[PDB]
Amino acid sequence: PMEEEEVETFAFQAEIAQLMSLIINTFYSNKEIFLRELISNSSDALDKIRYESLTDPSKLDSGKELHINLIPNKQDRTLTIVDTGIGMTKADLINNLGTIAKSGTKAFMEALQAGADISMIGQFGVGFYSAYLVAEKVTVITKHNDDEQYAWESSAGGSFTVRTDTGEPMGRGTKVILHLKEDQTEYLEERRIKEIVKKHSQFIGYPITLFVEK
Numbered sequence: 016p017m018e019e020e021e022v023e024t025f026a027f028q029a030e031i032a033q034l035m036s037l038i039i040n041t042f043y044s045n046k047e048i049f050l051r052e053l054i055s056n057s058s059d060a061l062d063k064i065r066y067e068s069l070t071d072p073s074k075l076d077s078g079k080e081l082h083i084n085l086i087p088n089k090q091d092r093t094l095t096i097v098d099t100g101i102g103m104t105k106a107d108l109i110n111n112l113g114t115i116a117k118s119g120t121k122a123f124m125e126a127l128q129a130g131a132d133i134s135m136i137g138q139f140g141v142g143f144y145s146a147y148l149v150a151e152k153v154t155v156i157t158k159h160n161d162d163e164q165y166a167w168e169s170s171a172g173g174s175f176t177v178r179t180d181t182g183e184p185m186g187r188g189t190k191v192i193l194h195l196k197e198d199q200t201e202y203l204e205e206r207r208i209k210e211i212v213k214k215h216s217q218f219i220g221y222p223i224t225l226f227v228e229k
Protein backbone atom coordinates (compact mmCIF):
# COMPACT_ATOMS: atom_id res chain seq x y z
CA PRO A 16 0.00 0.00 0.00
CA MET A 17 1.33 3.32 -1.29
CA GLU A 18 3.01 5.61 1.25
CA GLU A 19 2.28 9.35 1.35
CA GLU A 20 4.76 11.99 2.48
CA GLU A 21 4.55 15.74 3.05
CA VAL A 22 7.12 17.99 1.41
CA GLU A 23 7.54 21.64 2.24
CA THR A 24 9.28 23.83 -0.36
CA PHE A 25 10.81 27.15 0.79
CA ALA A 26 12.41 30.13 -0.94
CA PHE A 27 15.86 31.18 0.27
CA GLN A 28 16.16 34.68 1.66
CA ALA A 29 17.10 36.85 -1.33
CA GLU A 30 20.73 37.53 -0.23
CA ILE A 31 21.34 33.88 0.64
CA ALA A 32 20.21 33.03 -2.91
CA GLN A 33 22.54 35.73 -4.26
CA LEU A 34 25.35 34.36 -2.07
CA MET A 35 24.57 30.78 -3.16
CA SER A 36 24.63 31.72 -6.87
CA LEU A 37 27.95 33.58 -6.38
CA ILE A 38 29.53 30.45 -4.75
CA ILE A 39 28.34 28.10 -7.51
CA ASN A 40 29.11 30.22 -10.56
CA THR A 41 32.48 31.75 -9.74
CA PHE A 42 35.85 30.03 -9.74
CA TYR A 43 37.39 29.94 -6.28
CA SER A 44 40.81 28.72 -5.32
CA ASN A 45 41.08 27.01 -2.01
CA LYS A 46 37.63 25.35 -2.02
CA GLU A 47 38.96 22.81 0.51
CA ILE A 48 37.89 25.04 3.43
CA PHE A 49 34.26 23.80 2.96
CA LEU A 50 35.14 20.84 5.20
CA ARG A 51 36.52 23.11 7.96
CA GLU A 52 33.21 24.99 7.88
CA LEU A 53 31.11 21.84 8.30
CA ILE A 54 33.32 20.36 11.05
CA SER A 55 33.05 23.75 12.89
CA ASN A 56 29.21 23.50 12.89
CA SER A 57 29.33 19.92 14.17
CA SER A 58 31.77 21.25 16.76
CA ASP A 59 29.26 23.94 17.74
CA ALA A 60 26.36 21.42 17.88
CA LEU A 61 28.61 19.16 19.91
CA ASP A 62 29.33 21.90 22.50
CA LYS A 63 25.60 22.56 22.68
CA ILE A 64 24.55 19.00 23.53
CA ARG A 65 27.46 18.70 25.97
CA TYR A 66 26.43 21.89 27.83
CA GLU A 67 22.62 21.36 27.66
CA SER A 68 23.07 17.93 29.21
CA LEU A 69 24.87 19.18 32.33
CA THR A 70 21.52 20.94 32.96
CA ASP A 71 19.66 17.71 32.11
CA PRO A 72 21.51 14.35 31.73
CA SER A 73 18.51 12.63 30.15
CA LYS A 74 19.34 14.63 26.96
CA LEU A 75 22.04 12.01 26.35
CA ASP A 76 19.42 9.19 26.26
CA SER A 77 19.64 9.64 22.45
CA GLY A 78 23.34 8.75 22.74
CA LYS A 79 26.22 9.41 25.17
CA GLU A 80 29.26 9.62 22.81
CA LEU A 81 30.00 12.94 21.09
CA HIS A 82 32.05 12.61 17.90
CA ILE A 83 32.26 13.43 14.17
CA ASN A 84 32.44 10.77 11.45
CA LEU A 85 33.53 11.46 7.88
CA ILE A 86 32.12 9.07 5.27
CA PRO A 87 33.39 9.30 1.63
CA ASN A 88 31.59 7.05 -0.83
CA LYS A 89 33.25 6.57 -4.22
CA GLN A 90 30.28 4.65 -5.72
CA ASP A 91 27.74 7.49 -5.25
CA ARG A 92 30.07 10.54 -5.13
CA THR A 93 28.85 11.64 -1.67
CA LEU A 94 30.90 12.91 1.26
CA THR A 95 28.88 12.78 4.47
CA ILE A 96 29.73 14.67 7.67
CA VAL A 97 28.09 13.07 10.74
CA ASP A 98 27.89 14.52 14.27
CA THR A 99 26.10 13.47 17.46
CA GLY A 100 25.40 17.13 18.36
CA ILE A 101 22.12 18.69 19.52
CA GLY A 102 20.57 18.35 16.05
CA MET A 103 18.02 20.70 14.49
CA THR A 104 14.21 20.83 14.87
CA LYS A 105 12.02 21.50 11.82
CA ALA A 106 11.98 25.18 12.73
CA ASP A 107 15.75 25.15 13.45
CA LEU A 108 16.16 23.85 9.92
CA ILE A 109 13.90 26.37 8.24
CA ASN A 110 15.13 29.44 10.06
CA ASN A 111 18.81 28.57 10.30
CA LEU A 112 19.48 27.07 6.85
CA GLY A 113 18.12 29.55 4.35
CA THR A 114 14.94 31.29 5.52
CA ILE A 115 16.15 34.00 7.93
CA ALA A 116 18.42 36.82 6.64
CA LYS A 117 22.02 36.76 7.90
CA SER A 118 23.73 40.00 8.77
CA GLY A 119 27.11 39.09 7.18
CA THR A 120 25.74 38.11 3.75
CA LYS A 121 25.96 41.55 2.13
CA ALA A 122 29.40 42.31 3.61
CA PHE A 123 30.90 38.96 2.53
CA MET A 124 29.54 39.24 -1.01
CA GLU A 125 31.22 42.64 -1.20
CA ALA A 126 34.39 41.03 0.15
CA LEU A 127 34.42 38.37 -2.64
CA GLN A 128 33.91 40.84 -5.53
CA ALA A 129 36.85 42.78 -4.02
CA GLY A 130 38.82 39.52 -4.15
CA ALA A 131 38.96 38.02 -0.64
CA ASP A 132 39.66 34.30 -0.39
CA ILE A 133 36.48 32.21 0.05
CA SER A 134 38.41 31.26 3.22
CA MET A 135 36.91 34.34 4.93
CA ILE A 136 33.42 32.76 4.68
CA GLY A 137 33.38 31.51 8.29
CA GLN A 138 33.62 34.99 9.94
CA PHE A 139 30.56 36.29 8.07
CA GLY A 140 28.50 33.41 9.57
CA VAL A 141 27.52 32.04 6.12
CA GLY A 142 30.08 29.17 6.25
CA PHE A 143 27.52 26.43 5.63
CA TYR A 144 27.06 27.68 2.06
CA SER A 145 30.72 26.80 1.32
CA ALA A 146 29.27 23.31 0.86
CA TYR A 147 28.28 24.67 -2.61
CA LEU A 148 31.93 25.11 -3.55
CA VAL A 149 32.17 21.36 -3.99
CA ALA A 150 28.60 20.02 -4.13
CA GLU A 151 25.81 20.23 -6.72
CA LYS A 152 23.27 19.16 -4.09
CA VAL A 153 23.32 19.08 -0.29
CA THR A 154 21.12 16.95 1.98
CA VAL A 155 20.88 17.56 5.75
CA ILE A 156 19.35 14.86 7.93
CA THR A 157 18.84 16.07 11.46
CA LYS A 158 17.39 14.80 14.74
CA HIS A 159 16.92 16.95 17.87
CA ASN A 160 15.69 15.56 21.23
CA ASP A 161 12.59 17.77 21.03
CA ASP A 162 11.51 16.69 17.59
CA GLU A 163 11.21 14.16 14.79
CA GLN A 164 14.01 13.44 12.28
CA TYR A 165 13.80 15.79 9.27
CA ALA A 166 15.52 16.03 5.87
CA TRP A 167 16.50 19.38 4.35
CA GLU A 168 17.75 19.47 0.75
CA SER A 169 18.75 21.94 -1.94
CA SER A 170 20.28 21.97 -5.40
CA ALA A 171 20.49 25.74 -4.91
CA GLY A 172 18.61 27.66 -7.62
CA GLY A 173 16.57 29.59 -5.01
CA SER A 174 14.78 26.83 -3.10
CA PHE A 175 15.18 24.05 -0.56
CA THR A 176 12.84 21.36 0.71
CA VAL A 177 12.08 20.02 4.16
CA ARG A 178 10.24 16.79 4.98
CA THR A 179 10.09 14.17 7.74
CA ASP A 180 12.86 11.64 7.20
CA THR A 181 11.84 8.03 6.45
CA GLY A 182 15.41 6.79 6.07
CA GLU A 183 17.48 5.24 8.89
CA PRO A 184 16.74 6.78 12.34
CA MET A 185 19.78 8.62 13.68
CA GLY A 186 19.06 9.07 17.37
CA ARG A 187 20.43 12.63 17.75
CA GLY A 188 22.72 14.80 15.63
CA THR A 189 23.20 16.00 12.08
CA LYS A 190 24.12 14.28 8.81
CA VAL A 191 25.33 16.58 6.00
CA ILE A 192 25.51 14.71 2.69
CA LEU A 193 27.42 16.42 -0.12
CA HIS A 194 26.51 15.21 -3.59
CA LEU A 195 29.84 16.27 -5.09
CA LYS A 196 30.22 17.87 -8.55
CA GLU A 197 32.09 15.70 -11.08
CA ASP A 198 35.37 17.71 -11.11
CA GLN A 199 35.58 17.65 -7.30
CA THR A 200 35.91 13.96 -6.52
CA GLU A 201 39.24 14.58 -4.77
CA TYR A 202 37.36 14.93 -1.50
CA LEU A 203 36.60 11.22 -1.70
CA GLU A 204 40.30 10.45 -1.40
CA GLU A 205 41.26 9.51 2.16
CA ARG A 206 44.69 11.06 1.54
CA ARG A 207 43.05 14.37 0.62
CA ILE A 208 40.54 14.24 3.44
CA LYS A 209 43.27 13.53 5.99
CA GLU A 210 45.36 16.38 4.58
CA ILE A 211 42.68 19.03 5.05
CA VAL A 212 41.46 17.87 8.46
CA LYS A 213 45.04 18.23 9.82
CA LYS A 214 45.54 21.54 7.97
CA HIS A 215 42.30 23.28 9.02
CA SER A 216 40.37 21.31 11.68
CA GLN A 217 43.30 20.61 13.98
CA PHE A 218 41.96 21.53 17.43
CA ILE A 219 38.27 20.80 17.16
CA GLY A 220 37.63 19.38 20.61
CA TYR A 221 35.77 16.16 19.78
CA PRO A 222 37.15 12.94 18.16
CA ILE A 223 36.86 12.72 14.35
CA THR A 224 36.94 9.32 12.61
CA LEU A 225 37.33 8.70 8.84
CA PHE A 226 35.57 5.56 7.51
CA VAL A 227 37.13 4.16 4.33
CA GLU A 228 35.29 1.51 2.32
CA LYS A 229 37.29 -1.42 1.01
Ligand SMILES: Nc1ncnc2c1ncn2[C@@H]1O[C@@H]2COP(=O)(O)O[C@H]2[C@H]1O
Nearest residue numbers: 056057060100102103111112140143189
Ligand atom coordinates in the same frame (compact mmCIF):
# COMPACT_ATOMS: atom_id res chain seq x y z
N1 LIG B 1 25.76 20.03 12.03
C1 LIG B 1 24.88 20.86 12.66
N2 LIG B 1 24.28 20.57 13.84
C2 LIG B 1 23.39 21.45 14.40
N3 LIG B 1 23.06 22.65 13.84
C3 LIG B 1 23.58 23.05 12.67
C4 LIG B 1 24.52 22.14 11.98
N4 LIG B 1 24.91 22.73 10.82
C5 LIG B 1 24.24 23.92 10.78
N5 LIG B 1 23.46 24.12 11.86
C6 LIG B 1 22.65 25.32 12.04
O1 LIG B 1 22.81 26.12 10.88
C7 LIG B 1 23.34 27.40 11.29
C8 LIG B 1 24.04 28.23 10.24
O2 LIG B 1 24.63 29.40 10.87
P1 LIG B 1 25.46 29.25 12.24
O3 LIG B 1 26.64 28.37 12.06
O4 LIG B 1 25.70 30.57 12.88
O5 LIG B 1 24.53 28.28 13.12
C9 LIG B 1 24.27 27.06 12.41
C10 LIG B 1 23.40 26.06 13.13
O6 LIG B 1 22.45 26.82 13.87
